[PDB]
Structure formats: C-alpha cells, structure tokens
Design an enzyme around this catalytic site. Structure first.
Site, PDB file in Angstrom:
ATOM      1  N   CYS A   1       4.511  22.036   9.127  1.00 50.94           N
ATOM      2  CA  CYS A   1       4.724  23.102  10.131  1.00 50.94           C
ATOM      3  C   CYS A   1       5.219  24.307   9.332  1.00 50.94           C
ATOM      4  CB  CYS A   1       5.580  22.600  11.287  1.00 50.94           C
ATOM      5  SG  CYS A   1       7.157  21.841  10.804  1.00 50.94           S
TER       6      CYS A   1
ATOM      7  N   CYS B   1     -10.127  30.599  46.033  1.00 54.01           N
ATOM      8  CA  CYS B   1     -10.568  30.070  47.332  1.00 54.01           C
ATOM      9  C   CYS B   1      -9.638  30.748  48.330  1.00 54.01           C
ATOM     10  CB  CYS B   1     -10.606  28.539  47.308  1.00 54.01           C
ATOM     11  SG  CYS B   1      -9.047  27.734  46.839  1.00 54.01           S
TER      12      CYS B   1
END
Length: 587
Positions: A228, A518
């Site tokens: 990392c 929607c």
C-alpha cells in the site's frame, strides 16, 4: 490469548454483531488488545542513517530477522536495504512480502527486489494519491517500455474494472550481454476501490480481487509482493483475509486476533487501524454467508431450475431464498441524514428511499441558499466505471430545476425514465421535458429536437443549454413504456433494447453517468442498473452474479430492486438475453 480464542464459523455472524454493537465497541477493544510485537525484534538495518531516505515513516521499519535483503551492489554501500518484510500465510512461511509503496528514490530498489525474489505477482492496495497527498510513486509505464535501474519493464495488457485494474508486464534484467536472463510475465493486481475515508461499502470486491490473485500466481514464482503506502495497513488486511479464508476452509474456524498477532512477529503494525481490522471480519463473514454466487453462462439453466423450484425441506423457492438474504441486510439509518433534514424532507417522494451520505449526488448551492445542494439521487458503481449510474427519484414539480441542475453538473447525456407520469390514477413523476419546442428551469433551457418511437420506449433528442455558461449539450431521454402498472413486464425484449440504446448513446457521448429514474428511484431504477451491469459483464466475461450485483446496489441506495418479482425479472431478462444470442463466443 484466552479472551479472543478462535471462532467456529457457526458463531461468526453472532460474534461480529456483538463486536459491531455500540459503535464497534468490542472490536475496538480487540484491535487495541493486539500486541505491538509478540517477540523481541531489532530494526538495526532499517534505522541506519544511510537508509533514512528509503523509509516513508521513521516508526514503520522492517525487523532485521524478517526484512527482504537486496543483493549488495559493488561500489554502492548500504545497497542491501528495502522497506519490505517476509510474511507467513496460514500454513506457509514467507508466502508474501509486505512492502512499502516505493518512493521516487526507491522505485529502482522495488523492481530489483521483484526480480531478485522471483516475484510473479504484485498486489497494490492503494491509489497513487489521496487528496493530492502522494501515497505511492507510479513505478510502472502507461505504455511501451521503461528501464528502472537494470530492470526493463514492458506493458503487455491493462484490464480496468470498477473495483480493480490488472496490468501485465514483461520484465527482464538487462545490461550484461554475457548473461541474458529470460523475460518474465508479471501481473500487477491494483485494488482501486478502497475509499479515502472508511472501507469499501461491500467486501465482495476484495474477495473477487483475492480470488484473481490466487488463480493467477504461477508455480515456481517467489513471494507475492503486497504493498500500500506504508506497507502494513491495507497490506495486512489483504494477507490476513487470504490466511483466514484458508483457516475457514481447513478448520471451519477463524482466528483473526491470533493470526494478526503472529504476522506482527514479522512486521510492525500489520492491520494498522480498527476499521481495517473490522473489514477483515466483514470479508470472512461475506465469504461464509454467501460463498461463490458467480455462474458461467453454461451453468445458468441448472441454476434457474433451482431458483424457480421449491428448495427441498422448505416452503420457499431459490428466488425467495436469495431475496430473503437481500432484504435481511440492514438499511443504514445513520447514513441517510442529509435527505432527513427538515429543509430537504419535502424534496423526497418516499422517506425510506433517500441517499446514503457516502455516494449522495451533490449539486452546486444555488446563490446563497442553505440545503440547496440536495437531490434524492445516488451514484452507483457499474461493471467497469465507478459512478456509472445516477439512481434518482423522478422529479416532483418543485424539484424539476434541481433535477436539471444535477444532470448538467454531472454531465449526463443519457436519461432513462422507467415510469409513466401517472400509473393507477396516482402521480409518479413530474414532466421535466417539453412535449414541443422550449421550456426553461432556472439556468437550464431544454428544447425537443427529435423523437423516435421504438417498440417499448420513446427516444427524445433534447438540446440542453446552460444560459449562465452559454454551453449546450445533446442529451437523449429513453422513456420506457414497457413496465406494466402492476407486476413486471411479460418479457425482457424491451429492457434488453433500452439497455442497448443507452450503451450506444454512452459509447458516442463520453461515458458520463447515466441518469436513471422511476418514481421513488429504487425498484425499476435498481432493476435497470442491475441488468445494465449484468448484461455488460456477461458480454465481456460469460459470467453472471445476479445475487452480488443486486446486493451491492442495496448497499449503495435503499431498496434498489425493491420486490421479489423485480428480482425475478433480473433473472428472466438475463436468461432471455443468453437464449437470444446463444452462439455468442464468451457464453
């Protein structure tokens, strides 16, 4: 330690719940009870004055007994040092190298380690930057070839997906004509979906990432290099998940406390934060509860026989069994604060369907008005790109202007409408486009340029102009007429066609977030997002994971794919798509 003994798998869910309670109270105690180091270790080499520029942090130093030694370079004193440590697996010594992400001045050392260690696989669990802070030097070329010291690195292939990128390189030690070593194919697994704050919204990306790493690492290779930035935190998370999945498979137990304690004999601070520690448990639970739900297309008929029929010894079919696992997941009420503010409550159609804070679609504050940054809309990850969709409620009369400000701000060129304005005598959506000519909503003018009438949808070509900026964009609205007032469409033909039409519009307009709505912005909206993702992946890979696709949507916005029949519809459309294009090679 007798306070954190191994956990049998059948108590894993119960124990995680107890340990997560009162804001991860017992998990924080457990993490804080980890030993700094279970043995007496030294860091003489790491602490040498000559090695100071080679370390990102004065307090993250590899131990002498477990450090990765570079071969000494003649005429270069102290050339044996890199910030990296051997790390054991479940049952295997020195399975991994936990490495610091190289600094500009250690990129050459990093490649020399990869060559000298016979490494085939690099696992990168950091972005290069977090908030303009450099976390890791870019140690690979974007194209062609680059030589890092005596290591020639050639780009072979790059595959970008939403949660991780896989990069293939051909590497070769060069510079000696009398000793030409053969080239090696290196695969870099780059996890790109760990957020700057907190942890991934689902562990499934990390589990799929780990599966690919394991499948790809070849025989004869040396230690897998995991890094990392500092090389202890997310690096530790990755290594511990790998080891604990092995322990789960072999013993039907996990021992995260014991295993983290053990690898801290090899490197300081492995698993660096309480949230990284908790995420390990979340990933193990994800594996235990759901296992592998990916299906090759050739397995779908067998799966659908299971899904559509009663599960033996129960009163439910496979569809209901899967759907019950989806509805059993918790709606995170503490993440839905902004939409619940008094000033924003009237901007929501349905109280229970409002955005989570982490992916809420933020719009510019209008002039000097508070609470004007809010729309009931959520960014949703797709197959290849983060924020592929905006899952939005259909606008109310008083939110049409905010809806257009959202579309303009986030550069959408595709609007998918999955409702009529009225259904069963109830208002479901306010009309936000002109039926002919021009309409204005604050700074946004919308002109209807063309209409085409397809079998299950209307395509409306809109000329959208920001009159403040004096800039125009071609935006296509796909108005789906195929959704019945009750139940689900009888077939998937219309849904397949509208997904294809959107994909066509995206390909030619720059792949900006697709605005999907929607009425409340969850049920049909979730179905469209799920199917856009599943059909794209089935076409690219011939694999489908309807279960994890929908589960990830539920973790990004409440009630995405709201009902059992909508979940059924996802499977029905995928089956019809495969059956329609059955000679497609990847199937």
């Amino acid at each position: 330690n007798r306070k954190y003994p191994p956990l049998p798998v059948d108590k894993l869910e119960e124990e995680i719940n107890r340990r997560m309670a009162d804001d991860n109270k017992l998990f924080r105690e457990e993490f804080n009870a980890l030993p700094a180091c279970p043995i007496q270790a030294t860091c003489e080499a790491a602490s040498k004055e000559e090695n100071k520029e080679k370390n990102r942090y004065v307090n993250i130093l590899p131990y002498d007994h477990s450090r990765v030694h570079l071969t000494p370079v003649e005429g270069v004193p102290d050339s044996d040092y890199i910030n990296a440590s051997f790390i054991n697996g479940y049952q295997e010594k020195n399975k991994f190298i936990a490495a610091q992400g190289p600094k500009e001045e250690t990129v050459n050392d990093f490649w020399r380690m990869i060559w000298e260690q016979n490494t085939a696989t690099i696992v990168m669990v950091t972005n290069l930057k977090e908030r303009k802070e450099c976390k890791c030097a870019q140690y690979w070329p974007d194209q062609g070839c680059w030589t890092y010291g005596n290591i020639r690195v050639s780009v072979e292939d790059v595959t970008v997906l939403v949660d991780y990128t896989v990069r293939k390189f051909c590497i070769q030690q060069v510079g000696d004509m009398t000793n030409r070593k053969p080239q090696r194919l290196i695969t870099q697994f780059h996890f790109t979906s760990w957020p700057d704050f907190g942890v991934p919204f689902t562990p499934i990306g990390m589990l799929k990432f780990l599966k690919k790493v394991k499948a790809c690492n070849p025989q004869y290779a040396g230690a897998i290099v995991v890094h990392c930035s500092a090389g202890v935190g997310r690096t530790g998370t990755f290594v511990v998940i790998d080891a604990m999945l092995d322990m789960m498979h072999t013993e039907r137990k996990v021992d995260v406390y014991g295993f983290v304690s053990r690898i801290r004999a090899q490197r300081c601070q492995m698993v660096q934060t309480d949230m990284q520690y908790v995420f390990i448990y979340q990933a193990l639970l994800e594996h235990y509860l759901y296992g592998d739900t990916e299906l090759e297309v050739t397995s779908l008929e067998t799966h659908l026989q299971k899904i559509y029929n009663k599960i033996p010894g129960t009163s439910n079919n496979g569809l209901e069994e899967e759907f019950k696992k989806l509805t059993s997941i918790k709606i995170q009420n503490d993440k839905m604060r902004t939409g619940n503010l008094p000033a924003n409550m009237k901007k929501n159609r349905v109280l229970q369907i409002i955005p989570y804070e982490f992916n809420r679609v933020i719009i510019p504050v209008k002039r000097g008005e508070e609470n004007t940054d809010y729309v009931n809309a959520s960014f949703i990850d797709g197959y290849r790109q983060k924020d592929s969709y905006i899952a939005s409620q259909g606008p109310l009369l008083h939110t049409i202007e905010d809806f257009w400000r959202m579309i303009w701000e986030w550069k959408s060129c595709s609007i998918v409408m999955l409702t009529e304005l009225e259904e069963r005598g109830q208002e479901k959506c306010a009309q936000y486009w002109p039926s002919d000519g021009l309409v204005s909503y604050g700074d946004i003018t919308v002109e209807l340029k063309k209409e085409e009438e397809c079998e299950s949808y209307t395509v409306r070509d809109l000329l959208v102009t920001n009159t403040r900026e004096n800039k125009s964009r071609q935006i296509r609205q796909f108005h789906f007429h195929g959704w019945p007032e009750v139940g689900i469409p009888s077939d998937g033909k219309g849904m397949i066609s509208i997904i294809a039409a959107v994909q066509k519009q995206q390909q030619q307009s720059g792949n900006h977030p697709i605005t999907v709505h929607c009425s409340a912005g969850a049920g049909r909206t979730g179905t469209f997002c799920a199917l856009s993702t599943v059909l794209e992946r089935v076409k690219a890979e011939g694999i489908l994971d309807v279960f994890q696709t929908v589960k990830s949507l539920r973790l990004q916005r409440p009630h995405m794919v709201q009902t059992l029949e909508q979940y059924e519809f996802c499977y029905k459309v995928v089956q019809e798509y495969i059956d329609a294009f059955s000679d497609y090679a990847n199937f």
